[PDB]
Amino acid sequence: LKVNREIDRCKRVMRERVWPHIHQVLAQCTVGAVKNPGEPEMPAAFITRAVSGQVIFQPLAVGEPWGTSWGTTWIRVEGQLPETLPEGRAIELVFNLGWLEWPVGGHIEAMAYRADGTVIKALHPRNHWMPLVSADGVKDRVVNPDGSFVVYVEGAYNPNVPSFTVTELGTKPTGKADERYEFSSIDIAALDQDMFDYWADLDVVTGSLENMNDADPRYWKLAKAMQRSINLWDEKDYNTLALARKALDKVMHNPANASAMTLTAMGHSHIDSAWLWPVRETERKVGRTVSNALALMDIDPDFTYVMSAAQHFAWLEERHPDLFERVKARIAEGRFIPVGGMWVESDGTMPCGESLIRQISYGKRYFKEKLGVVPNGIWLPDSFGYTGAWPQIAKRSGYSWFLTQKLCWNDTTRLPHHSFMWEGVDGSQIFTHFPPADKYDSDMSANDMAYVQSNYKDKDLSDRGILLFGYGDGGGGPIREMTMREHRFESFEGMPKVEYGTPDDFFSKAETEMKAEAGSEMPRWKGEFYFELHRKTLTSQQEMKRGCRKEESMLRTVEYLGVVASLESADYVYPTERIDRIWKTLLLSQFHDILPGSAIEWAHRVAREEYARDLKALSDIARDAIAAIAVANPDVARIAKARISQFADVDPWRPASLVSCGEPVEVNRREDGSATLDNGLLCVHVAADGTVDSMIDLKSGREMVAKDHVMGRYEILKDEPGVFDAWDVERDAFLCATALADGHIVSIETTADGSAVIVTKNSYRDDEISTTITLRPGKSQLDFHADVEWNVPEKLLKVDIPMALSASRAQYECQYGLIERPIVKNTEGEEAMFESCSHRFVRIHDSSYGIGVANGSTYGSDVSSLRDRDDALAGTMVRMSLVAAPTAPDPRTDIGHHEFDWTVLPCASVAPLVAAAGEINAPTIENMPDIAAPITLEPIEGTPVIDWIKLADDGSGDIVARLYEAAGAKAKAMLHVGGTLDGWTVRETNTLEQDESYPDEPAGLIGGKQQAEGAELALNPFQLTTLRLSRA
């Protein structure tokens, strides 16, 4: 059609006949540079060293790469600012350092400083210009009395790292220029605002023709004015410009339709704290983005910008002190908004409950003392699913709403609604919203308006949405082209109304109006947000998953010992600052890019050796605190190899030992190679090739292994996905798995305590798996411990546990509580859940029985039914993923020597499973005097569990316990305290240890603040309460 061919003419007119005549080049500047391929130094220490004499600045070469990979080049620019400058026009430098266009935050960047150490503005691929004079006769401070000036530019020659492709770029500074980026004559230019407005109008108009339909007369009244204008603009006669704009004005002022939506736009750039670059680079990225944000708050007023991740604010505070005081000046104004008080945008499903609570707490604490703000909602646009315990934690932490967008990438199903009420397992509900643009980084195009209005899933009762724009995922922020195409879409009949705003006000009014409109028809979602994509993120880099749990499972012990030692010994200083530093370092390695393990080899290498260092430092605070208890109770008892595991079967926080102390375990070797372990409580029969093939529960007398199957068979899948190698698993892999039928028992023995051990070996073509199966006296559980020497890439290992019990749903655990997922997947959407998360245990049960499996560091599994060889129902298979080896961002990921531990239990109720999980995840310590816990609850009914006894953060000396219910039934208990804190009071708080109550949340205590000894507790299913004990 004629119009579609007229759109191409208009776009080419924009690109060649209008765009170049915006920056009129006046003069070019002399340049000299100094290169450095090493690690960068602080800019302030370089400038003052670069002002006196101590740098030479050998001139650059036009047409050659100005740096090396992962290096820094400092450039001294000197211009002249000649006279006869155009009147009423702005003057600005233009830096064209060989930019590409596709990745904004990916390849090279830069930052321009003044000759005192102060930032001017950052330089990015699509935003490369620096204001000298502002079209009003006022100059920047870096201008002499004459036209002389001098600028320093720190340029980062970051390589462009492909997402999924084998490369050597994400390892270390190479010292070579792999991708060539030229220099090409930094220059000075005058800006023409009228041509720039004309280009903006053309852009707005021509982008609306691709998205309208040829049925409204506006499609034709537009395409006529677009044609009349470009037929009138002759770039060789400037006086025609004023004629061309008047033609493209009879259509720019048309009031929006009556029923059009209303969008609240705010500037937002998402910065992945570590992904495709080292963590030593994110600091500069935050600096650049923030500087860009403030240089756009003087192009126009009423422009708003949001920023999350208090850790980014801290990084900014240390590197650019001057750029911090400019932010605070905008915060008090109201145009700069910090949102979602959290340390970093953590992962949404893997961290435990205490991780999330501590993230919220540290974030709220930083946002208070520094910026003085109190956020009202959780900002989490990018995450691989959400745990389902989030609503309760958010509501009990003072929050009011919630924000997500990542759940659009699901491979099978689309969620029904965009704005809805999300109810967790407890019952508390939070208002949640997805930005209808289906992405956080928009460019404020006409395509995005058309999509937002034509995709919004609740247009019948909401007509209100949010809209984020800016260049994200690597920084950069929004560009001044986006802001000046927003004023065109303010009314613009044919498209949604758009206006600036803050998130809190949008959320308040949107929720209240949707409520008062819908009635008791408000959309609702109960449960978790299962992410139907990126299944391999549960096991991508195993040393990160093992590190997140081992460090956090022992922070519990270290913090508990600080409580016990601060009550026994009269002089013992609890090291608050070391613990705070360790906690912040931990919360930084739970970002949504490094816990899933989908970053470059460099990032994981640094994050891995941090776990080693903080693990070591933690087990010195422990032994130094235990030394204090050892002198306070000098003659009670001391045991080596103790494990303080919360919620045991008899004594909750007593430090139990490793010596089992039962009667020996009789072992009956058979002649064919098989063996028979038999303690008082189990009768295990191990076959000739590992693989326990029958397990009797001698108490009840039930087989525990599904017939014609063996427990412990190893499979190795062949996973070579289409895209996102380190991210997701094909379903095809589940078809290709091959068992390792070869194998044998290496050794059968008994030990000093009386337990029996069996040592097995297994191999697949290069690598070796040696398992140790243990049976201890007086414990109704079987323990497995495997050591892997993984060497072959592109493979995936997992073990299976065939259970002799058949049910319709499987039971996992959440951060606080439990969930169930189907076993046999019926519909198309259910088959998308073929692999799922599991914190610390999975249970398959029925009305009166059940079998459970608890793990140490795995985090991943999948369940399916089992059918006998005569085709009758046999049981259920539970497979849990151990280690995978991708190749995309990390060529040499997960090579060599992984450990794994797990255990299998017969459990009618859920209490012994929780006890076994807690007891397998606890760290070991030495020379620990065994003394009763200070806080104890006697269970009158149900199963309440005290999780995280710890000290107060106010330094006052109070105790804070975080107790919940872990069975799904109401629980009644009462508190008993030891003889070291009698006379103390107890009271109820929120998760942040503050006296704040909420009318829509039940409480634990009955009454108010009363005596601790004898206070009673009632807990409705999956409730999370926090007790605070004070001396008075």
Q: Give the residue with the Cβ less far from a second copy, 636 or 792.
A: 792
Q: How many other β-carbons are positioned within 10 Å of the β-carbon of residue 11? A: 14
Residue 846 binding result from Zn ion, a second copy, none, given CB thresholds of 5 to 8 Å by partner type: none
Q: Give the residue with the Cβ less far from Zn ion, 6 or 382.
A: 382
DSSP E strands in 184-326: the ranges are: 187-191, 262-267, 305-307
Q: In Å, what is the CA distance from 249 to each residue of 3, 202, 252, 258?
A: 19, 11, 5, 22
Q: Give the residue with the Cβ less far from Zn ion, 356 or 814.
A: 356
**SS3 letters for 138-163?**
CECCCCCCCCCEEEEEEEECCCCCCC
Q: Give the residue with the Cβ less far from a second copy, 345 or 835.
A: 835
Residue 411 binding result from Zn ion, a second copy, none, given CB thresholds of 5 to 8 Å by partner type: a second copy
Residue 532 CA neighbour count, 13 Å, CB half:
15
Length of the chain: 1032
State both tokens at 1011.
């005596």
The answer on whether 382 is annotated among ligand-binding residues is: yes
The answer on whether 270 is annotated among ligand-binding residues is: yes
The answer on whether 845 is annotated among ligand-binding residues is: no
**CB-based contact 500:296 (threshold 8 Å):** no
Q: For residue 844, which amino acid is it? A: I
Q: Least CB distance from residue 412 to Zn ion, whole Å?
A: 23
Q: Give the residue with the Cβ less far from Zn ion, 309 or 971.
A: 309
**CB-based contact 146:23 (threshold 8 Å):** no
Q: Least CB distance from residue 280 to a second copy, whole Å?
A: 32
For position 723 contacting a second copy by CB under 8 A, the verdict is yes
Q: Least CB distance from residue 306 to a second copy, whole Å?
A: 34
**CB-based contact 608:279 (threshold 8 Å):** no
- The residue with tokens 């339709």 is 257
Sites for a second copy among residues 887-906 (CB under 8 A): none
Can you tell me which of 59, 722, 979, 999 binds a second copy, judged by CB under 8 A? 722
Can you tell me which of 287, 503, 721, 912 binds a second copy, judged by CB under 8 A? 721
Give the end-to-end CA distance of the chain in Å, rounded to a whole number: 84
The strand pairing partners of 423, in sequence order, are: 429, 526
Q: How many residues bind a second copy (CB under 8 A)?
A: 13
- For residues 411 and 533, give the distance between their C-alpha atoms in angstroms, rounded to a whole number: 6
> Of 154, 159, 170, whose CA–CA distance to 69 is shortest?
159
The answer on whether 347 is annotated among ligand-binding residues is: no
431 backbone dihedrals φ, ψ, rounded to 5°: -80, 125
Interface characters, 386-425, with a second copy (x: CB under 8 A): -------------------------x--------------
Task: Find the part of the chain contacting a second copy (CB under 8 A) among 351-359, 461-469, 715-723, 960-968.
Answer: 715-723
537 backbone dihedrals φ, ψ, rounded to 5°: -70, -15
Q: Least CB distance from residue 410 to a second copy, whole Å?
A: 13
Q: In Å, what is the CA distance from 881 to each residue of 65, 383, 592, 743, 906?
A: 46, 21, 20, 20, 22
Q: Least CB distance from residue 270 to Zn ion, whole Å?
A: 5
Residue 382 binding result from Zn ion, a second copy, none, given CB thresholds of 5 to 8 Å by partner type: Zn ion
For position 730 contacting a second copy by CB under 8 A, the verdict is yes
For position 163 contacting Zn ion by CB under 5 A, the verdict is no
Sites for Zn ion among residues 365-424 (CB under 5 A): 382
Task: Find the part of the chain contacting a second copy (CB under 8 A) among 1-9, 542-550, 560-568, 970-978.
Answer: 1-9
Q: In Å, what is the CA distance from 932 to each residue of 58, 570, 592?
A: 72, 19, 40
Residue 753 binding result from Zn ion, a second copy, none, given CB thresholds of 5 to 8 Å by partner type: none
For position 272 contacting Zn ion by CB under 5 A, the verdict is yes
- For residues 109 and 942, give the distance between their C-alpha atoms in angstroms, rounded to a whole number: 59
Q: Give the residue with the Cβ less far from Zn ion, 405 or 781.
A: 405
For position 17 contacting a second copy by CB under 8 A, the verdict is yes
Q: Give the residue with the Cβ less far from a second copy, 6 or 753.
A: 6
Q: Give the residue with the Cβ less far from a second copy, 9 or 707.
A: 9
> Of 610, 497, 486, whose CA–CA distance to 550 is shortest?
610
3-state helix, strand, coil in the chain (%, to 5): 25, 25, 50
For position 720 contacting a second copy by CB under 8 A, the verdict is yes
- For residues 976 and 982, give the distance between their C-alpha atoms in angstroms, rounded to a whole number: 10
Q: How many other β-carbons are positioned within 10 Å of the β-carbon of residue 448? A: 22
Task: Find the part of the chain contacting a second copy (CB under 8 A) among 7-15, 231-239, 814-822, 916-924.
Answer: 7-15
Q: How many residues bind Zn ion (CB under 5 A)?
A: 2
- For residues 1011 and 976, give the distance between their C-alpha atoms in angstroms, rounded to a whole number: 11
Q: Give the residue with the Cβ less far from a second copy, 6 or 993.
A: 6
Q: Least CB distance from residue 194 to a second copy, whole Å?
A: 46
Using CB under 8 A, list all residues that contact a second copy: 5-6, 8-9, 12-13, 17, 411, 720-723, 730
Known binding-site positions for Zn(2+):
270, 272, 382, 592
Using CB under 5 A, list all residues that contact Zn ion: 272, 382
Known binding-site positions:
270, 272, 382, 592
